[PDB]
DNA sequence: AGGCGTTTTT
DNA sequence: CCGCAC
């Protein structure tokens, strides 16, 4: 039986996804279809410019309807193409179950007319340049109106959007606006009081008063930056905010009191008036950043009141053409005793020492500090040692040089409770003096620095605590038998992308350090260019994980005896990566000599045509098998053999031009199947004995299907539907004539 | 005529 | 195969 609602797709939680398949107008569905089951409809990027009466009309219980991009204004249309969309007038009444609706990127001037019901309405990136009672009339439930973007320099409209005086005030329920890019001189006047989230960013409001603000005491979020901007930072087209502005009367936020998060983001701020956060006693975020306040940071009192202040963001308040010798923050930042969280990446400051972060260092919540971006070349990293709450120290992208004068393959840093990122800086060798004072230490990553030197057990000495060890992006050359023994509790080595060493031809290395890291789990040497004279065997009896991917085992498993049994002494291993090893051939022997243990073996975009398949048995334990980006010309030369315990197989982007009859049915196990951008000419129950049923996933996709009238295929796709992700759509004919490209589905074939 | 195309936010 | 100790 089809799929019930060509040529969208049925998703969980009722929800009929209709999202880029080029339609012009609403699909109306089959009447024997569940229309009373849809709560949502997507309808994502589509081409529909014409909207009608009949088209929601049968779906009753819809509460969900996304409309967006179908017909985008010349702005933001890719190649500037212009489009206006009409909308017959009981479009939307007649769906009285609606409560969220998105006509965003659509070429509309009016609101049209929308049920009582209606919950939440995204009108951004709109032609609607005016709110008058008349356009939102009836809508005494509406929380949410979201309305950004109507003109901008991607969506121009040569005036202000004008939202009249008042002409909001109809919805008493409204606790969310927002009315970004939108080209306005002042804040709309009288505007609901139940407000919650008022987001004004990006306009030209330069002045701000308290009438302003008026009667709006329910606001716990006030977002006006952008409104004045700092053009020497700005990515995009921007006007500079004009000499002598902008200008905040100190009272402007005095009556919110509920006011939890305030943005004054890129507002050319020289100077910060305290009285402009008295009565800001929830205050818990506040972002001041791309403002001008690096020499108000060192006097300012304005912090002094903020008891509940837990996000502090001062980034990028960098003074021009300029970095400082020194910063040393002001005494008041001492009283914000609820900080968690401060960021000053991108002020430019040179050096990092005890007075710079003096008033923060007795803050008991203060958890992440991020310091990135600062031309810091000088830094004492012992001022942390005595930080009482420290997780997370961002100091990348700065050029400190030394001591001052999938997770299944490589864990994260997120869970554990002491890192510090001193990646993209400027260090050649590890100077053991600079770690002195942070052997509390648990994560340490120095990825993208220059590291040229020979480790040999000497360098990490204090960092006795440290689990993880990013190295990636460096030039170590791995030599000396005793590297990386010094950390005792190393569990997760990352020495990826160290390349420049083994292209040194002629010149060998050595990775014996490896069998002495006794609770070492994972271990990267991906995109190294390992290809000769390096060590015969690695050892260990306790890793894990071994990305091996993009060296040349090629070149290694050429070359005799030599490096046969490379893998086999990692005696617990259970996941390994191969792929991209310019592998173009294996032996039997070379797949009997991995670790017996091994449950993931990947081989992708390597240039294997061929695989002896019964050779699956000498990894008793594989569940997991990656070939995709291979070059096998079929699924033969024997079958999966018995008693495999193979669970994933992803034979995607090969060549494959045909299967055998009962290749899979002896894989009692397969779960998923990937034979995706193949040659593959049609799809055949007998591939799968009759055990094809147990498949939770069979992705057939982008393969040349020969869609002849009662291909058997179409039959066989229909009994294991639920399996085949994007069926409806993306399953696709390669022959005959007309129906190339086309969707299986566009026309019956039985 | 309409087409374009997976588009975050700035 | 990179200051070892013919
Ligand atoms: C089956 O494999 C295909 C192709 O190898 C997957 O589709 C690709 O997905 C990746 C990321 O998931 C993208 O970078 C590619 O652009 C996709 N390519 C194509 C041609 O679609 C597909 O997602 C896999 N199937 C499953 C069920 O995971
Ligand atoms: C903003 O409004 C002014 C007129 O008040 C106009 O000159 C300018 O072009 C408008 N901006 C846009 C993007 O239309
Ligand atoms: C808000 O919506 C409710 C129903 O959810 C309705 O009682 C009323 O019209 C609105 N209430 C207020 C206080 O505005
Ligand atoms: C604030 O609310 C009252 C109505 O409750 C009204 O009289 C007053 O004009 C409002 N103020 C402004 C500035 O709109
Ligand atoms: C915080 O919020 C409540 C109302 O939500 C307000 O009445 C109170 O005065 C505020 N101030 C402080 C210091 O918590
Ligand atoms: C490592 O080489 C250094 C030179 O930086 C030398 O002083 C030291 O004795 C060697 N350390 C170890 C642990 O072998
Ligand atoms: C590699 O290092 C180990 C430990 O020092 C050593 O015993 C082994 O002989 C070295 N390999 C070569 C080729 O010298
Ligand atoms: C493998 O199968 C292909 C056909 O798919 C055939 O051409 C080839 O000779 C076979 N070789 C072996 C060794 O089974
Ligand atoms: C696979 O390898 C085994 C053992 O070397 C051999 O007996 C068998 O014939 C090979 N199969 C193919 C199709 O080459």
Redo the contacts with the bound molecule.
């Keep these: 039986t089809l799929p019930p609602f060509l040529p969208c797709e049925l998703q969980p939680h009722g929800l009929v996804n209709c ?2 398949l ?1 339609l ?1 107008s609403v699909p109306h569905f089959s009447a024997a279809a569940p229309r009373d089951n849809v709560t949502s409809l997507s309808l ?4 529909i ?1 014409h909207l009608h009466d009949s088209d929601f009309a049968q779906l009753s219980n819809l509460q969900k309807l996304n409309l967006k ?4 204004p010349a702005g933001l ?7 206006h969309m009409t909308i017959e007038p009981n479009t939307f009444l007649a769906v009285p179950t609606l409560e969220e609706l998105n006509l965003s ?1 659509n070429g509309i001037t009016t609101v049209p007319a929308l049920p009582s019901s209606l919950v939440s309405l995204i009108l951004s990136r709109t032609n609607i340049l005016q709110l008058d009672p008349t356009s939102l009339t009836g809508l005494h439930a509406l929380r949410f109106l979201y309305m950004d ?1 109507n003109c ?1 320099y ?1 969506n121009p409209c040569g005036r202000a959007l004008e939202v009249a005086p008042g002409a909001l005030l109809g919805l008493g329920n409204l606790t969310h606006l927002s009315l ?2 939108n080209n306005l001189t002042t804040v709309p006047r009288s505007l609901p009081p139940s407000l919650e989230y008022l987001l004004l ?2 306009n030209h409001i330069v002045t701000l008063a308290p009438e302003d603000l008026a009667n709006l005491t329910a606001l716990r979020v006030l977002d006006v ?2 409104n004045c901007r700092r053009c020497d930072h ?3 087209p921007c006007v500079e905010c004009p000499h002598k502005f902008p200008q905040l009367h100190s009272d402007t936020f005095s009556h919110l009191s509920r006011l939890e998060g305030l943005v004054l983001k ?1 507002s050319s701020l020289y100077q910060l008036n305290p009285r402009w956060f008295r009565g800001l006693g929830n205050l818990t975020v506040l972002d001041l950043s791309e403002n001008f306040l690096y020499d108000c940071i060192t006097k300012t009192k304005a912090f002094q009141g903020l008891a509940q202040l837990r996000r502090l963001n001062l980034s990028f308040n960098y003074h021009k053409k300029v970095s400082f010798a020194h910063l040393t923050l002001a005494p008041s930042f001492g009283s914000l005793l609820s900080l968690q969280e401060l960021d000053m990446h991108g002020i430019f400051f040179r050096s990092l020492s005890q007075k710079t972060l003096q008033p923060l260092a007795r803050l008991p919540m203060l958890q992440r500090l991020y310091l990135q971006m600062n031309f810091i070349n000088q830094a004492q990293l012992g001022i942390f040692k005595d930080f009482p709450g420290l997780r997370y120290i961002d100091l990348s992208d700065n050029r400190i040089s030394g001591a001052v004068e999938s997770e299944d393959f490589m864990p994260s840093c997120k869970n554990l409770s002491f890192t510090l990122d001193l990646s993209r800086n400027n260090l050649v060798t590890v100077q053991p003096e600079m770690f002195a004072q942070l052997s509390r230490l648990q994560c340490l990553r120095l990825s993208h620095n220059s590291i040229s030197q ?1 480790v040999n057990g000497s360098q990490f000495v204090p960092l006795t605590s440290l689990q993880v060890l990013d190295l990636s992006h460096n030039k170590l ?3 000396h038998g005793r590297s990386f023994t010094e950390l005792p509790r190393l569990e997760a080595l990352d020495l990826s992308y160290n390349s420049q ?1 083994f292209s ?1 031809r ?5 990775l014996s350090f490896v069998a002495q890291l006794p609770t070492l789990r994972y271990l990267s040497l991906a995109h190294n260019g390992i290809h000769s ?3 015969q065997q690695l050892c260990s009896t306790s890793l894990w994980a071994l990305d091996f991917s993009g060296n040349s085992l090629s070149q290694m498993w050429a070359e005799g005896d030599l490096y046969l049994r490379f893998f086999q002494g990692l005696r617990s291993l259970i996941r390994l990566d191969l792929s991209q090893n310019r592998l173009h051939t294996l032996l039997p022997c070379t797949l009997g000599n991995l670790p017996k243990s091994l449950q993931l073996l990947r081989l992708r975009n390597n240039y294997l045509a061929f695989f002896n398949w019964s050779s699956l048995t000498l990894l008793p334990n594989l569940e997991t098998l990656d070939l995709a980006g291979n070059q096998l010309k079929a699924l033969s030369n024997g079958s999966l053999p018995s008693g495999t315990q193979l669970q994933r197989l992803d034979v995607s982007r090969n060549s494959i031009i045909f299967v055998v009859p009962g290749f899979f049915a002896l894989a009692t196990r397969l779960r998923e199947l990937n034979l995706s951008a193949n040659a593959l000419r049609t799809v055949e129950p007998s591939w799968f004995g009759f055990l094809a049923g147990s498949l939770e996933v069979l992705d057939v996709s982008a393969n040349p299907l020969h869609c002849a009238c009662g291909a058997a295929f179409v039959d066989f796709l229909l009994q294991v539907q639920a399996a085949v992700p994007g069926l409806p759509s993306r399953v696709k004919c390669g022959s005959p004539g007309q129906l190339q490209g086309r969707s299986i589905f566009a026309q019956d074939l039985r």
């Design positions: 999202n880029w080029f012009k994502l990027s589509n081409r410019h991009w179908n017909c985008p249309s890719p190649m500037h193409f212009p489009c990127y973007g901008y991607k970004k890019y960013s990006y930056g952008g700005a990515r995009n890129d020979a050359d791995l030599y060493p040194m002629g010149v060998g290395h050595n004279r390096v060590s």
